[PDB]
Design a protein around this ligand. Structure first.
Ligand code: SRM
Ligand code: SRM
Ligand code: SF4
Ligand code: SF4
Ligand code: SF4
Ligand code: SF4
Ligand code: SF4
Ligand code: SF4
Ligand code: SF4
Ligand code: SF4
Ligand SMILES: O=S([O-])[O-]
Ligand SMILES: O=S([O-])[O-]
Lengths: 435, 104, 385, 435, 385, 104
């Protein structure tokens, strides 16, 4: 409750206002057109505005620390939360979030989303997040008793499971991949879906030293940002040559086809200049444009995607496709932010994905036993060493594994690699080298 | 709130965890049983409870799931068959340990 | 009344279904997508917020991208569904930046859909489904919970996002930038989301050490977890007193504390939020794509700006200035990070007029050294005067 | 003379052989043309080769650990060393090295060097290093009793001091500077000399937590490698415009003047392409060549020296000269190698160099008290922080101080900068926020 | 036999002169240099090893740069002097890379000096004063004591250096590289000199943990220093019992030891040198100048090659191979590091034929992460086959 | 080698430092005196020696120069007046501490 001068300011402006939206739901629940027997207070969203408005005045959150709730059989999936002013805002005394498993790349039908809304209107606040940063559909705010009821309905009537939370595998997500992109090197959605199903047990029951995330990108552009927001990133690529259609190249040069598919049409950058916008920007300088012909020295191409991104009608990805595996990405806490480090330069990416799955399971076998409490894979890599990760995955060290070799000489060697081993008697040495 | 059961009193939070480990008593386990989907307490149940209690007193923290399974010899699957809510919300709660924290 | 789903609290394990996962994406595909998946030839951005993909067989699918607040009601969701049923045969999707996309299979329906979307606004005035976010623009802001749901924030999320998108709205509905500019916000240093890899990142930070609730700490906290949670080893175990009696607690060396709040994440007896102390740190220069230059982390350029609900003007203004200067000085295809790597940091600050403070110089462990300048290469700027 | 099969192999080849030279000295002392009464065994050099030969065979050094010798009044300058086979090689049983202070940029006169040789031939081995890596004239091999004698001759007769060794300021060194280079931005030799004389007490007597070195470069090209091999590096530069002679530029474009003063002459690189070899290589791209006219946007020039290095006859350093101060360079141990980090972008560098001395003394005052035992300045910087260094030198933080700003958010603030300070009552917090 | 200086060991402090420092350089200046110092107009490289500087007034000074073994006898020094008295009025100097420069004021004297220098050789055959080291060439090698004088080496200095300069001799007497190539050597990881900032660096390394003389250690060593000397905390204080005697000592966890030898530097009771264990690590890509690109550290590309006295064939061949491939494939003005940065590491390895091993992947503390590859950008090479 | 003085025997190395700190005794100082340019031992010399011995016994290492001066109140200059060879080669040697190590 209930007057909200500060929040009202956020109803001004062009961008869709979350306040105006929350107020619409408050009005809908107060009117109750469908005569629903709300299983939590109809005024739930109203109290959420009110406590939010108070936070705006005090500049301080009003949610108590933590909360541990859930459904039988799972060790995660619900983020419990209790407001710190129960008497002032009874509508949000309990305000739990339920994370629901979403379809890969978030394709939906109205019938399905409406079905979900029907369950949530009856048993929840009527508020959601579409979607949480990891990918889950987020049902924002309900009471403890409704958790099992919501779960029962989702599984029995909507054939939908909960997502993940805690020290386990989290909900995997992918870019839209081959569903609507000509750059996709593999079926990201399919890999995402199959693996999510294959590792349900790891996702619902915390068995890991800490959280673990999967993300699948169809190419280096990183539309789901797997390299920055997942412990195990699978990013598609090709091994053969980029495909060049000279007729299409001439159409770009002539102005018929617009660079970057028209992504820079809101400004006059002048006529397309293939030399300055493509050949001259290639990071490896492996492209050539002569006598009106465009060529690529594929051997020296790092497949960064720039030329393809800029002339998508003329330059296509190769036909010998697969993916790269990069691991260890994580936010700063504790030892510093990390992005995925290249582990497997090229691996098969076709269903049933046995190749990728073997790498995943080998990493888990090691990490589940060696990782310290609350230690992300990336931090275990830092502590134990990249070389250890290569061993455990049976991966041969290659130059591609470094952005630069080490510049410190503190090199460890295996005893068996050193003639004579490490057992030495000081007395013998001292017969050559007196004290 | 304060749970009143079997002539005993147990201060708890909104999630039903004991506010003080030292207030634990055998009746606490008998109280929380149904709420944790447990109808009958077996020796295997006590074995887990006993380990969590010793580990906590000795180390000051709840044991990692890996350690819990390795010592008791119970795999995670068995652990859930014993405590439907899991080692945290279920076993730890029943053992009197404090509520688990962090990102879930 | 109690309206049961069928669940039995007396026999919870009865009838329980588990490990079914999500529904398969294929069940929700538009027919044009299901039929042509994997056989796409090329695409074209027709206008701001409107794309077209053409299959090898000539089939086409048009996509209209609409901004969305992420935090939304079932009523809003239902409206998106009403639109999808009216023009898209009941299909829609959401993007990795939380925008909504409606897809149709022909140009006549596309014109109708677009005209429809433009008419939808909230009573108070804002567009319900603004069209845009394609090409070289600013497409929504990846954000977090803030004061709407989390216990560890140092700032809000939804409020600042609305404030910033309002001022950058013209950039969402047009494609005039040198390259895409990704803006992200996180309400605390846990940095959920995308802050650490965005062109412009906003992170809530604290400036005061946590308070220690000695009377309840030992009861509510796993001491060792709190000790091991500190990146700067500022927490240690100590004997304290409660009511003249000895108890186990912790001690915080304020000179080693940089107020990250990780100890509070692990221990409810160490709260630290503070209305006047909390604020936002502004970062820039990150990206995750591998286009031309390799991915990069965003760097802190403004250590602290105060929280100023409901529109965070100081912060909003700085974000706007950075985008304006960048859009004016950067070369085509240059991401903010690329641009700065070209002109140099001293020029970045000179052109933006932003005040550089010692707080931006890294001092965290050995890697900090690498952030300093090991070269005589520098340009003279007002800084040196 | 010992048999030396393996060393003999090193008398072969075109490069001046140290073996042939040492052998010549053995012969000289054997004949003793001058009739000296050698204060150490005439066969000293003969034994060094003998023991060096043994080391070649066995693959291991034959010097005992350490040694602590010196002259009264000083805490260093002499590196003690004892062979570990004194019965086999009596002539190197004691084999101490005396570090002798050398003139700046190592300019000498025959009379001077000959005088030094006269003393050495008598009291040492006849063997030297010219020069040690820090700079010193190195007198390689003598016996303990000779030290005081040497030191007395050096001071009373040759007006020359010992160099430094140990936990103190070491011998400073400079590039040749204005003596023979048109790129020199200040008198490096003078600064080197003046500061060596000023700081003598700090050089001869260990007062520091560890070793400390000064190196002075006339410009960025780094001919004494100050930014790599000194804790406090002074590198010259200018702050005004690069001087451009258009006609000379034309002489380059035409072929009359050779690029880089002829440095690449030994190979056919094509004719000079000012665009390809200069304008296009400029790090900042601030150069332009239009209509046979070269110009430089100096505001965006980082003074890397490339264009000047390439067209020395047409492009000259500015007239408003000074230097940059970079600090912290050191080799790996313990914590990793460091190059100097920019501290003072531009500072005056005219005799008697007070501004620079001010910085030196402020750093020492801090480091001397805060540095841990055997901790190099660079490591103190990493542990305590760059911001502390700025504070103690009264230096305002500027963007020039970083290559990039931090990407972690673990930011420290000073209490005084935070409204309300850090003293808070949790009691008052609980008023707003119920447990 | 004793010949005094006048020093009185009975009254050591009498007549002691201290703190006089070095003789002033100006004392030693050839006339033309003293007169025109600070007034130089330009310079020219006339041939390999021969330069001329022209003052603004027109005066000229010609310089002839000659190679030297650094480790030299008074007879040699003497010889340099004689030459200077004959052609340079008794003046001469030494470079930062331990070459000898002779200077004259006219071309006629210049030609006479050069002709003479070319006739000076040792009885064995090597040139005493080879001319060169200028321009884009391989000048002298910066190096250390080795087995000639130090107790902590893992390899020799003078021997290797000779072996390598013989093989690269043609590169010293000509100017045919894309840019200068600095070669430096250090006999142990303390890295005295320049190995960590050279185009090609050679570093002596150990492969075996030190032996512990438990019996005498406490006696000989300050235990806390040995413990603190370890970068990997492999050393710990212990109470040992040797021959039934209780003594303080240290224990080394061979699993944490990487044979740096720092503990030996601090404690004579932890010797670690080994004939078959010791060898050389090869590094490339460093530079100190700020020309175009910023300075950089050399990087380990070959973790281990064996010591092979007296000419270290294996190591020498690798050095020659690197120089050969670089000279052929690098563009004008490209230092080895610049070239590698352009072609990439996998290509460097493909082109040189060098074996890449996991030993080259950094694993030392937090900063090691930054050396791994955080990008999808890579080239397919023989390695991935 | 082994030093014989005032009926005592001190094992020493080539630089004159005692092989074993426990073999130190007052006769040692009287023996070392001249070698280290000291004609007569003063109250100040002994105060330095005393400090060095207590510090070594307590910490296992020789004190840093800044600690030696700060504690004894003797500036570096005074410390050299007392011990011409310096705190290391002179004072430590005379105090019976082991030979200094590291680079130089
Ligand atoms: C809901 C969500 C933010 C959002 O509004 O989108 C979120 C919310 C929280 N995150 Fe997260 N994280 C969310 C995406 C992320 C991401 C991004 C991603 O997954 O794509 C990251 C960065 C990637 C990574 O894993 O590092 C992220 C890194 C963190 C961290 C830092 C972990 C680290 O190793 O550095 C924490 C703190 C911790 O784990 O101790 C954290 C902690 C938390 C907690 C659980 C805080 C707590 O102690 O309870 C937050 C709960 C807020 C609430 O009240 O609901 N969250 N978090 C996102 C998950 C919802 C989903 O089911 O779809
Ligand atoms: C003689 C010389 C090598 C040479 O052949 O040229 C040398 C010789 C030694 N150096 Fe040095 N260093 C020499 C230049 C350097 C340089 C380069 C420079 O000064 O230009 C460096 C790198 C820059 C720096 O200061 O880091 C250097 C960094 C070291 C280190 C590593 C220090 C560090 O912080 O990482 C050590 C080991 C240590 O101090 O613990 C060391 C240790 C040593 C010792 C004292 C080893 C020991 O424990 O006794 C060596 C004595 C060998 C001997 O028997 O004479 N020396 N040392 C050079 C000095 C002579 C002269 O007075 O002019
Ligand atoms: S990651 Fe590549 S395949 Fe996936 S939607 Fe983005 S550009 Fe297409
Ligand atoms: S994909 Fe990137 S590396 Fe390969 S040719 Fe195109 S622009 Fe150059
Ligand atoms: S960023 Fe910090 S405060 Fe914001 S949702 Fe993630 S954990 Fe909570
Ligand atoms: S706030 Fe962060 S820095 Fe301060 S004591 Fe807690 S965990 Fe350590
Ligand atoms: S550092 Fe610069 S001024 Fe000194 S000799 Fe080298 S070029 Fe000349
Ligand atoms: S010195 Fe370097 S930065 Fe300045 S103009 Fe000449 S090439 Fe460009
Ligand atoms: S590099 Fe190591 S082995 Fe060689 S001189 Fe310096 S300290 Fe002695
Ligand atoms: S050799 Fe180096 S890594 Fe091994 S114990 Fe000694 S100091 Fe530690
Ligand atoms: O929920 S966060 O931990 O990914
Ligand atoms: O000799 S080293 O300490 O420079």
């Amino acid at each position: 409750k209930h007057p909200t001068p500060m929040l009202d300011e956020l109803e001004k402006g062009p961008w869709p206002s979350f306040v105006s939206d929350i107020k619409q739901e408050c009005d809908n629940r107060a009117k109750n057109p469908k005569g629903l027997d709300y299983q939590i207070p109809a005024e739930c969203p109203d109290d959420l505005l009110g406590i939010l408005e108070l936070s705006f005045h005090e500049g301080e959150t009003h949610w108590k620390h933590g909360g541990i709730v859930g459904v039988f059989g799972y060790g995660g999936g619900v983020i419990g939360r209790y407001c710190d002013q129960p008497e002032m805002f009874p509508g949000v005394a309990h305000f739990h979030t339920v994370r629901l498993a979403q379809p890969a790349a978030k394709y939906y039908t109205a019938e399905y989303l409406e079905a979900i809304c029907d369950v949530w209107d009856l048993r929840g606040s009527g508020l959601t997040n579409m979607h949480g940063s990891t990918g889950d559909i987020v049902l924002l705010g309900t009471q403890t008793p409704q958790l099992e009821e919501i779960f029962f309905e989702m599984t029995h009537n909507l054939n939908t499971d909960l997502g993940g939370s805690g020290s386990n595998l989290r909900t995997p997500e992918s870019c839209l991949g081959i569903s609507r992109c000509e750059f996709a090197c593999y079926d990201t959605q399919l890999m995402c879906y199959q693996l999510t199903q294959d590792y349900q047990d790891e996702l619902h029951r915390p068995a890991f030293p800490y959280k673990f995330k999967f993300k699948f990108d169809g190419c280096p552009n990183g539309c789901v940002a797997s390299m920055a927001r997942s412990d195990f990133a699978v990013i598609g690529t090709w091994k053969d040559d980029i495909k060049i259609d000279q007729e299409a190249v001439k159409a770009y040069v002539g102005g018929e086809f617009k660079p970057n598919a028209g992504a820079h049409a809101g400004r006059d950058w002048g006529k397309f200049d293939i030399e300055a916008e493509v050949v001259g920007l290639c990071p490896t300088g492996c492209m050539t444009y002569e006598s009106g012909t465009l060529s690529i020295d594929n051997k020296n191409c790092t497949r960064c995607m720039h030329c393809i991104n800029t002339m998508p009608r003329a330059l296509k990805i190769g036909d010998e496709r697969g993916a790269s595996i990069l691991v260890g990405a994580k936010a700063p806490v504790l030892d510093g932010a990390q992005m995925g480090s290249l582990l497997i330069p090229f691996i098969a990416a076709e269903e049933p994905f046995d190749e990728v799955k073997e790498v995943i399971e080998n990493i888990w076998e090691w990490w589940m036993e060696e990782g310290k409490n609350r230690e992300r894979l990336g931090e275990t890599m830092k502590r134990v060493g990249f070389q250890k990760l290569l061993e455990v995955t049976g991966t041969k060290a290659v130059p591609q594994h470094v952005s630069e070799p080490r510049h410190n000489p503190y090199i460890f060697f295996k005893e068996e690699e050193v003639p004579g081993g490490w057992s030495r008697d000081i007395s013998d040495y001292r017969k050559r080298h007196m004290r | 709130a304060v749970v009143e059961f079997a002539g005993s009193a147990f201060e708890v939070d909104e999630d039903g965890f004991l506010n003080a480990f030292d207030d634990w008593c055998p009746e606490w386990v008998k109280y929380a049983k149904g709420s944790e989907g447990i109808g009958a307490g077996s020796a295997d149940h006590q074995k887990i409870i006993d380990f969590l209690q010793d580990y906590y007193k000795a180390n000051g923290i709840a044991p990692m799931v890996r350690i819990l399974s390795k010592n008791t010899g119970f795999a995670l699957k068995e652990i859930y068959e014993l405590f439907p809510s899991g080692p945290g919300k279920g076993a730890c709660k029943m053992a009197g340990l404090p509520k688990p924290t962090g990102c879930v | 009344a109690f309206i049961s789903s069928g669940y039995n609290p007396a026999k919870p394990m009865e009838n329980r279904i588990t490990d079914i996962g999500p529904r398969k994406f294929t069940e929700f595909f538009p027919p044009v997508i299901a039929k042509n998946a994997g056989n796409w030839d090329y695409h074209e951005i027709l206008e701001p917020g409107i794309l077209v993909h053409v299959a090898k067989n000539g089939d086409k699918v048009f996509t209209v991208r609409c901004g969305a607040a992420r935090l939304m009601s079932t009523s809003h969701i239902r409206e998106a569904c009403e639109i999808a049923k009216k023009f898209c045969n009941g299909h829609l999707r959401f993007t990795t930046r939380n925008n909504i996309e409606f897809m149709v299979d022909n140009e006549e329906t596309l014109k109708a859909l677009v005209a429809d979307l433009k008419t939808r606004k909230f009573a108070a005035g804002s567009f319900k489904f603004p069209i845009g976010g394609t090409g070289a623009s600013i497409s929504n802001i990846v954000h977090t919970q803030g004061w709407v749901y989390c216990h560890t924030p140092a700032t809000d999320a939804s409020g600042p996002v609305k404030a910033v998108m309002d001022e950058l709205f013209e950039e969402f509905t047009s494609m005039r930038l040198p390259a895409i500019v990704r803006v992200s916000l996180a309400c605390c240093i846990n940095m959920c989301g995308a802050v650490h890899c965005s062109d412009i990142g906003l992170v809530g930070i604290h400036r005061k050490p946590p308070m220690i609730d000695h009377e309840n700490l030992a009861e509510l906290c796993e001491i060792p977890l709190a000790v091991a949670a500190c990146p700067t080893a500022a927490v240690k175990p100590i004997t304290a007193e409660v009511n003249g009696q000895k108890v186990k607690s912790v001690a915080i060396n304020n000179d080693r504390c940089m107020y990250c709040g990780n100890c509070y994440t692990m221990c409810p007896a160490l709260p630290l939020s503070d209305g006047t102390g909390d604020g936002i740190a502004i970062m820039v220069g990150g990206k995750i794509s591998n286009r031309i230059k390799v991915p990069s982390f965003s760097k802190v350029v403004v250590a602290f700006v105060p929280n100023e609900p409901p529109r965070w003007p100081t912060m909003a203004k700085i974000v706007k200035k950075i985008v304006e200067v960048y859009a004016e000085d950067a070369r085509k295809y240059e991401r903010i990070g690329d641009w700065i790597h070209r002109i140099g940091w001293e020029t970045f600050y000179e052109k933006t007029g932003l005040e550089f403070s010692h707080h931006c110089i890294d001092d965290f462990r050995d890697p900090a050294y690498y952030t300093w300048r090991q070269s005589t290469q520098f340009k003279f700027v007002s800084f040196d005067s």
